[PDB]
């Protein structure tokens, strides 16, 4: 059977509209999923929404709507966005669904029964503008009384914090410390790069993992603990178990869970790596479940006032980009312009240049020039590939195969910007081959009709390579390119058809009415 590959995005918090930051993660996961399907894996790709907590209740109440009324509307918009981006997610998990809530309940009750969780009192220091709870050691300008911290200010904003106390269940995560460090040793690529792993260990694990406050009693909008109804399960357990609840864990049908768990890749931005690389494996250990194989963290899309944030309002709406510039342009920009190992600033000027110069100009003109020449010189009948007849062909056919090899290395290491630049080196060289060979000169005399046919064959086969390699990234252009070239054999759209250059060994009738590939 096909080997399974399970990839997840984070579940997003619908306290406001999603922005291109969210689209970046979801498109990234989609490219991985599409690539793995093309490599012959049995893929499951999950995304969804994190719907509980005070902030959601507040948003709903402000809008004059019930919590579920508010959420259903937000979720409809999120699902519409993923459909518009042509995301190939196999499921959409909502934490309000009973399939999820059942797992949250059962996990919590199991940990209580085992004694991993016990009843205590949560204490935190709340800052209104930061919407954050701090520990006493994080406070700046700490005020003391009888050798005990009684007040302070937020380290982020400097706003006066307020002491909050409430009954809360705690999960003793520190018991699992040695097992977690052992796991990191046995799985050296679980967290990357090495600096990030050291970061996790030194900042959080080393000084000692504090007990984790896994319930709250001060609000009602969440999953209630069956054995103690006045407690609601907090973010840690509720959100993290989405990755297993979506697979039917602890349901009447665990077949998806039995197949796909453990996840091959959990994808996220850097700020939630700690939760996925410490809390999540510890929770899984407490449940006697296999751990995920890899946490993949990318950087932030920034604006010129910091990280793009829906609560801040410094946002770019992907719907606006798609509506104005098209889907291929939007997906291309996200994957090409913003490497995962860096934070990058969005600008409209960079978006426009990237999509006009690379898509419409470089690739789009290559296809139109090529088809136009086939129609002009051979009345639409593309001559069959024969061999490397032109002087430049040997080296260019070698470049095609090297392009596939390099691309594969980049894709395997999740260096998508590099994979794309590598494909574009080949596209640009194919345009240069038109200029070098000057087909119009060869079309002057019937003595060169054979060589002209060879040049046309090489342009089309180069285009085919590019189109196949772009199938994980672009959902419209490759299909359109195959349709205009009238390559109908589904096999010639797959990676295996790139092993040996020159598959089109019969003549084909290209389109007589070519049209722009983009937008
Ligand atoms: N937006 C949230 N803020 C509180 C997060 C904890 C402290 C913040 C730590 N720093 C962050 N920046 N975290 C973050 N933005 N999201 C997050 C994502 C995954 C996990 Cl497991 C934990 C937190 N919570 C949320 N997404 N879900 C939630 C679910 C159930 C209930 Cl009852 C209440 C809330
Ligand atoms: N600016 C961004 N750059 C890259 N990814 C992002 C960005 N914003 C959100 N994401 C994706 O969404 C996930 C959750 O981010 P979250 O929605 O908490 O950020 P946010 O938009 O700042 O939210 P809030 O404004 O409510 O704090 C991230 O882990 C990441 O996968």
Longest dimension (CA), the chain: 101
The verdict on 240 and 229 lying in the same domain is no
DSSP H helices in 279-392:
280-286, 318-325, 327-337, 348-354, 365-378
Instruction: Give the C-alpha separation, 416 to 332, whole Å.
Output: 10
CB 186 within 8 A of CB 142: no
Query: Ligand 1 centre from 235 Cα, in Å?
Result: 5
Which atom of ligand 1 lies at the shortest distance from residue 223's CA? 32
Do 20 and 103 lie in a common domain? yes
Overall resolution, Å: 1.7
Beta carbons within 8 Å of 224's beta carbon, 6+ residues apart? 230, 231, 232, 233
Separation of CA 68 and ligand 1 centre (Å): 19
- The answer on 44 and 78 residing in a single domain is yes
Whole-number Å distance, alpha carbon 15 to ligand 2 midpoint, is 12
Cβ atoms 238, 283 nearer than 8 A? no
As annotated, the binding site includes: 310
Domain total of the chain: 3
d(CA 6, CA 8): 7
Q: Are 135 and 125 in contact (CB under 8 A)?
A: yes
Edge to edge, the sheet with strand 162-171 lists 132-134, 117-127, 162-171, 212-213
What does the chain come to in residues? Answer: 519
Helix (H, G, I), strand (E, B) or coil at 4: strand
Buried b (16+ CB within 10 A) or exposed e, 11-30: bbbbbeebbbbbbbbbbbbb
Verify that 486 and 364 share a domain, yes or no.
Answer: yes
Domain termination residue (choose one: 200, 235, 270): 235
Cα 251 to Cα 98, 177, 248: the distances in Å are: 10, 30, 5
Residues 21 and 123 in one domain: no
CA distances from 355 to 50, 221, 326 (A): 33, 44, 10
* Neighbouring residues of 390: CB distance < 8 A, sequence distance ≥ 6: 437, 451, 454, 455, 458
Query: What spacing in Å lies between the alpha carbon of 137 and ligand 1's midpoint?
Result: 21
Residue nearest to atom 29 of ligand 1 (CA): 235
Bridge partners (DSSP) listed for residue 140: 153
Rounded CA separation 88/82 (Å)? 8
Distance 241 CA to ligand 1 centre (A): 13
**Cα–Cα distances in angstroms (integers) from residue 474 to residues 8, 175, 334, in the given order:** 20, 47, 11
How far is Cα 332 from Cα 150, in angstroms, rounded to an integer? 52
Q: Of 179, 203, 235, which closes a domain? A: 235
d(CA 148, CA 130): 24
Cross-strand bridge partners of residue 11: 48
Count helices and strands in the chain by DSSP H and E runs: 20, 19
Burial label for 311, CB within 10 Å (0-12, 13-18, 19+), is exposed
Of the candidates 180, 185, 214, the one whose C-alpha atom is nearest the C-alpha of residue 284 is 180
176 close to 141: Cβ distance less than 8 angstroms: no
SS (H, E, C) 419-430: HHHHHHHHHHHH
Q: Are residues 382 and 519 in the same domain?
A: yes
Binding-site residues for ATP sit at 310
Say which residues have a Cβ less than 8 Å from residue 124's Cβ, sequence separation at least 6: 133, 134, 135, 163, 164
- Contact between residue 214 and residue 207 where contact means Cβ atoms under 8 Å apart: no
Do 30 and 125 belong together in one domain? Answer: no
Regarding whether 357 and 340 lie in a shared domain, the answer is no
Q: What's the first-to-final CA gap in the chain, in angstroms?
A: 39
Strand order through the sheet with 301-303: 306-307, 301-303, 344-345
- Which of 117, 111, 64, 70 lies closest to 94, judged by CA? 70
Verify cis geometry, omega within 30 degrees of 0, for the bond prior to 169. no
**Which structural domain, as residue segments, surrounds residue 519?**
347-519
Residue 162 backbone phi and psi in degrees, to 5: -130, 135
Ligand 1, pocket residues at CB < 6 Å: 13, 50, 52-53, 55, 222, 232, 234-236, 238-240, 271-272, 275
* Residues 275 and 304 both lie in one domain: yes
Q: Considering only CA atoms, which of 133, 124, 215 is closest in space to residue 163?
A: 124
Instruction: Please check whether residues 262 and 283 belong to one and the same domain.
Output: yes
Query: Is the distance from CB of 259 to CB of 290 less than 8 angstroms?
Result: no
| Shared domain check, 388 and 517 | yes
Contact 241, 104 (CB under 8 A): yes
CA angle 230, 233, 238 (to 5 degrees): 155
Of 292, 316, 346, which closes a domain? 346
Pick the closest to residue 358 from 517, 482, 515, 471 (CA basis).
517
Neighbour tally for 424: CB within 10 Å: 18
- Residue 512: DSSP 8-state: S
Say how far residue 408 (Cα) sits from the centre of its chain. Answer: 18
Residues 127 and 111 both lie in one domain: no
User: Residue 301: nearest ligand to its CA?
Assistant: 2
Q: Measured between alpha carbons, how far is 196 from 483 in angstroms, rounded to an integer?
A: 45
Ligand 2 atom at minimal distance to the Cα of residue 302:
1
* Residues preceding chain discontinuities in the chain with C to N over 2.5 Å: none
Secondary structure (3-state) at 103? helix
User: Could you tell which of 231, 235, 245 is best to mutate to test the pocket of ligand 1, judged by most ligand atoms within 8 Å of the CB?
Assistant: 235
Burial of 318 by CB count in 10 Å (0-12 exposed, 13-18 middle, 19+ buried)? buried
């Amino acid at each position: 059977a096909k080997e399974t590959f399970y990839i997840t995005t984070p579940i997003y918090y619908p306290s406001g509209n999603l922005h291109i930051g969210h689209a970046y993660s979801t498109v990234a996961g989609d490219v991985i999923a599409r690539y793995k399907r093309m490599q012959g894996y049995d893929v499951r790709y999950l995304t969804g929404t994190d719907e509980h907590g005070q902030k959601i209740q507040e948003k709903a109440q402000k809008a004059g709507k019930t919590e579920i009324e508010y959420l259903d509307e937000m979720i409809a918009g999120i699902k519409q966005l993923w459909a518009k981006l042509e995301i190939s997610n196999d499921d959409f998990i909502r934490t309000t669904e009973e399939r999820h809530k059942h797992v949250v309940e059962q996990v919590f009750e199991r940990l209580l029964k085992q004694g991993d969780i016990y009843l205590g009192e949560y204490e935190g220091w709340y800052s209104v503008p930061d919407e954050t709870y701090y520990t006493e050691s994080q406070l700046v300008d700490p005020q003391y009384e009888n050798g005990k911290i009684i007040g302070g200010k937020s380290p982020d904003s400097g706003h006066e914090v307020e002491l909050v106390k409430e009954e809360s269940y705690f999960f003793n995560i520190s018991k699992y410390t040695d097992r977690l460090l052992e796991f990191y040793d046995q799985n050296p690529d679980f967290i990357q790069p090495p600096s990030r792993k050291n970061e996790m260990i030194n900042n959080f694990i080393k000084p000692g993992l504090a007990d984790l406050a896994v319930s709250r009693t001060s609000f009602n909008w969440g999953v209630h603990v069956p054995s103690n109804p006045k407690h609601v399960v907090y973010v840690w357990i509720d959100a993290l178990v989405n990755y297993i609840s979506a697979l039917g864990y602890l349901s009447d049908d665990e077949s998806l869970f039995n197949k796909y768990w453990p996840a091959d890749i959990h994808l996220m931005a850097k700020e939630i790596v700690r939760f996925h690389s410490i809390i999540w494996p510890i929770l899984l250990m407490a449940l006697d479940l296999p751990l995920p194989k890899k946490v993949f963290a990318h950087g932030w899309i920034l604006m010129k006032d910091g990280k793009m944030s829906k609560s801040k309002g410094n946002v770019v709406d992907p719907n606006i980009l798609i509506d104005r510039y098209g889907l291929d342009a939007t997906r291309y920009y996200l994957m090409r312009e913003l490497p995962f190992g860096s934070d990058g600033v969005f600008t409209p000027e960079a978006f426009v240049e990237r999509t006009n110069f690379d898509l419409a100009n470089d690739l789009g003109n290559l296809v139109n020039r090529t088809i136009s020449m086939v129609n002009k010189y051979f009345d639409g009948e593309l001559p069959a590939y024969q061999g490397p007849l032109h002087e430049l062909d040997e080296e260019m056919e070698a470049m095609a195969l090297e392009t596939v090899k390099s691309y594969t290395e980049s894709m395997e290491s999740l260096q998508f910007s590099v994979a794309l630049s590598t494909v574009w080196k080949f596209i640009s060289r194919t345009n240069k081959y038109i200029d070098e060979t000057t087909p119009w000169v060869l079309a002057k005399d019937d003595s060169q009709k054979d060589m002209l046919g060879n040049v046309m064959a090489h342009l089309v086969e180069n285009i085919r390579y590019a189109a196949v390699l772009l199938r994980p990234f672009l959902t419209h252009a490759p299909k359109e390119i195959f349709e205009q070239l009238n390559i109908n054999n589904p096999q010639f759209m797959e990676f295996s058809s790139l092993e040996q250059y020159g598959v089109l060994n019969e003549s084909i009738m290209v389109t007589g009415q070519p049209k722009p590939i983009f937008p």
